[PDB]
């Protein structure tokens, strides 16, 4: 719709302004129970021909149930936590004796209901499949006949749709040992996920958001294995509660700003270190250095606030005016002259320096742009592909308005070579103090002579 970004050339970086946030901040758990009969041996005399497939179907089903019985650039400032927190707690509550019997009892005929456990937790229940009725009315009155023989084989396929799901369960929990990301549709179908959303204690606009984006919330959701006893095999979804929705939030790409000095290797340069996502949760901002935890879909981002920063709302002031006495403005400086380019939502920032051929080409008129020196910026609806160094890349092709503001070589605001290149985290205040103290040291050394 109205995607925009403004490439600052004072410090070479793009701010992909205009998106809606839909960030999660909580966890919502729910129990899903799949009931099942503790089937004995078939008690069949002879093998027959029509009744063969049911035998290995039930045998593989037994193998499944027995094996699952036997189952039981700013990342350094970022924190770490236990994502599996509430669901494992709910399963641990279900480990207590006499608790899961209440879920068994209350959820007898109604497909979904509410129970309360011994800690007052009263979220929701669901029973996903109905193996009691089908097993005890459609399988064993046929299977347990004298010298057993099915009426027909064409009645088995519906049981297949009642069994294969279980099988999926099998080979996705014997390899993952309890936790599966993303959540498969075999634990939770699409329409039933829509039902769980309409059963969530959330607002209706979040319900519409979930209904439009079932695949993303399916991607980010968790699953944790609960107990297996008294044939009520169950698992907890820790589908994310979404705290804040629809605030504008931007992807800051940063790019090298390094001088094209004739003497190679003597070109100090300071480049911004602020990669990632920023958006205003309450009166502060949530920062995400992990672009991988954040996912994009049709101007809708979805990301996890556990590995976020609750930084003050003064981050736009340093974004526009980098030299401001209100923010630390973390900048990384080094003598590296690396021809590097990035792709924003609506353009490409090339920063190639030294002997590096830099061309931006279309498939219509051949090559169309050439970058000699300095960081340069091209809108996405000006080019299609870019060749830099020895590599080609393709710019995004979404419709939007992008603008390039004229900046300045901030690297020339400092001394030609005083900057150290022996650190991995610094700010403009720390570097300015280093410059001031080195200037004081050299003037003292000149004065003592």
């Amino acid at each position, epitope marked *: 719709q109205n995607i925009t970004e403004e490439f600052y050339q004072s410090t070479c970086s793009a701010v992909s302004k205009g998106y809606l946030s839909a960030l999660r901040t909580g966890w919502y758990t729910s129990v899903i129970t799949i009931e099942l*009969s503790n089937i004995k041996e078939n008690k069949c005399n002879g093998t027959d021909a029509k009744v063969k497939l049911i035998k290995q179907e039930l045998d593989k089903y037994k193998n499944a149930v027995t094996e699952l019985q036997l189952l039981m650039f700013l990342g350094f400032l970022l924190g770490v936590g236990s994502a599996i927190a509430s669901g494992v707690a709910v399963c641990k509550v279900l480990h207590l004796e006499g608790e899961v019997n209440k879920i068994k009892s209350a959820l007898l005929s109604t497909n979904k209901a509410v129970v309360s456990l011994s800690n007052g937790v009263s979220v929701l229940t669901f029973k996903v499949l109905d193996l009691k009725n089908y097993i005890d009315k459609q399988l064993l009155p046929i299977l347990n006949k004298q010298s057993c023989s099915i009426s027909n084989i064409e009645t088995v396929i519906e049981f297949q749709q009642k069994n294969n799901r279980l099988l999926e369960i099998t080979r996705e929990f014997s390899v993952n040992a309890g936790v599966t990301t993303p959540v498969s549709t075999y634990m939770l179908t699409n329409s039933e996920l829509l039902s769980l959303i309409n059963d969530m204690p959330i607002t209706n606009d979040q319900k519409k958001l979930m209904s439009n984006n079932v695949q993303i919330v399916r991607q980010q959701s968790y699953s944790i294995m609960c107990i297996i006893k*008294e044939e009520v095999l169950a698992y907890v979804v820790q589908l994310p509660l979404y705290g804040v929705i629809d605030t504008p939030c931007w992807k800051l790409h940063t790019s090298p700003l390094c001088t094209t000095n004739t003497k190679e290797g003597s070109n100090i340069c300071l480049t911004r270190t602020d990669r990632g996502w920023y958006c205003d949760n309450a009166g502060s901002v949530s920062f995400f250095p992990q672009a991988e935890t954040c996912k994009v879909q049709s101007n809708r981002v979805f990301c996890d606030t556990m590995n976020s920063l609750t930084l003050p709302s003064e981050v736009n002031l340093c974004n526009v005016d980098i030299f401001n006495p209100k923010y630390d403005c973390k900048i990384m400086t080094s003598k590296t002259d690396v021809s590097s380019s990035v792709i924003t939502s609506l353009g490409a920032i090339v920063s190639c320096y030294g002997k590096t051929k830099c061309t931006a080409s279309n498939k219509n008129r051949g090559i169309i742009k050439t970058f000699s020196n300095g960081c340069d910026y091209v809108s996405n609806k000006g080019v299609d592909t870019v060749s830099v160094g020895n590599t080609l890349y393709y710019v995004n092709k979404q419709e939007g308005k992008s603008l390039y503001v004229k900046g300045e070589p901030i690297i020339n605001f400092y001394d030609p070579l005083v900057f150290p290149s022996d650190e991995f985290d610094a700010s403009i205040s720390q570097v300015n103090e280093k410059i001031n103290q080195s200037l004081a040291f050299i003037r003292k050394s000149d004065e003592l002579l």
Partner: antibody
Amino acid sequence: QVQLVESGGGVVQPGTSLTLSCAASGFTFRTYAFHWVRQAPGKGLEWLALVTYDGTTQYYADSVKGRLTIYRDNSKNTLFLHLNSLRRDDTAIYFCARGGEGSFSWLGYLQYMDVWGQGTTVTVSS
Amino acid sequence: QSALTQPASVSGSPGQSITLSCTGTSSDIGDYDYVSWYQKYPDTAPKLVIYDVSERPSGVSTRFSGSKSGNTASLTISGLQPEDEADYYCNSYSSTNTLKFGGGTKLTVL
């Protein structure tokens, strides 16, 4: 030791929906299953109902279904039937009985009569 | 109330054999190998006698023997004692997910 004992019973008015309570001691409770049968003076046995471990798959006879319900307790180990719309024909003795050894829910596995109690006479009169 | 056909009363002198039976349909005691036979005394409890067609449980004499053929189940006894004056029942899993009893069979001696 294995035993069952009985409570309730006696003279009941027509209608007058009744809860009948069994009792048991001296063996495992939660594992096996219990069930109810009747027989009238002059008539033979006829099946009433069965429950499994916990409250699950409450099975009933075709000529009884809807009229009588059954629910068990694992805290005080007592069988609770409750019958409704009491006709004239229900004057009979009601027997607790027990069946099933493993944790099974299929009715074919639950057809075994390992033990019996003493039942209770229930009569309807006016 | 549908039931299972049985003789009302069978008479046998002591030390003989009786081959009492009950007959149903295929969706009944016929097949499904849930033939059940029970003894009962007047005003006392019933008691397990025959289950799984031919196999005997605890606390019953060896002279009991159960069988079935077609849609008729049968119980055979050998060398009677005066203590078998009782009434007998047959029980089965019907096809409509329910249990079905018999009409009762009285058995005595002179």
